[PDB]
Subunit: 94 residues, 4 copies
């Protein structure tokens, strides 16, 4: 099945994202074949640099909500307490 | 720029989605070249039929929030009052 | 019935909130008897000033989703295009 | 400080809410003095019974996001994997 996974950073915590970014990408690397689409949400203006990042969005294949839960819970970003909001939805291409 | 557009149906309103579905798809057709990814969110279980639809998710190119606003406001689904929640975020591929 | 109405400002749009604030409060004044709880969401840090505002949250009595829709649509804040996200839920005290 | 804590149940999981409800209320009891407003979100129709519950909303006093995090993480509902979405915002009365 496919799941949307939307996660928005807490205010004032951009540096937490930056501090944990390499670990986050290392965490995702062996999982890449299950990720269909993925990237940061961005804030004000038109910039697309690290400083513009405000959250994380992914569309991922998983066999169960349990698998999705483990993926989210084991993320360096989650363990770092980066996020103020997390939204998960089952989903399919139109 | 790219925008995530997440919209979740009001409870008890699946039939409103069904009633307006053809009009919604007609609305999207001439806009298809700007839509990167799109499809319905799905509810309980593993079904992927019309009866399983619970909302709409799209990633779309637009030049401004104003363009995104017009796209959302002119949607048959929006005019039908289908949605309980609407979330829009600027976004980029990782 | 009671409804939660959660609305989060677009990035970079604090001044839009400030510009429309008096009009927003004027809009709410004759409706105050239907509002149980209400106030701005706040951003980073501990400040509680105008500059700290990031969104609007209200719990309101209404007879229908239609009434809620009209309340939201007629708000100066909505007409100003202040919000990136809007979430509405029916709700009751525990 | 005050925080909005909004949590929406996964689809098909009403019985998980029911199974863990007594434990959840037992968890909240010694914390009641910090909870300003609280109750379930409700689904379709006008019913206000257990079967109508779809999520949890609270406004709570806490000294830090860390305290909010612990409150959320230790909830029987969280440990049961009840929720598809969790949104936390700092907030004040208007």
């Amino acid at each position: 099945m496919l799941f949307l996974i939307y996660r928005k950073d807490r205010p004032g915590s951009l540096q937490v994202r930056i501090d944990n970014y390499a670990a986050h990408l290392a965490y995702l690397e062996p999982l890449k074949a299950k990720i269909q689409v993925g990237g940061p949400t961005l804030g004000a203006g038109t910039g697309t640099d690290d400083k513009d990042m405000t959250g994380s969005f992914l569309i991922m294949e998983a066999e169960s909500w349990d698998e999705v839960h483990s993926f989210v819970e084991n993320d360096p970003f989650t363990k770092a307490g980066l996020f103020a909001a997390t939204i998960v939805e089952r989903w399919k291409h139109g």
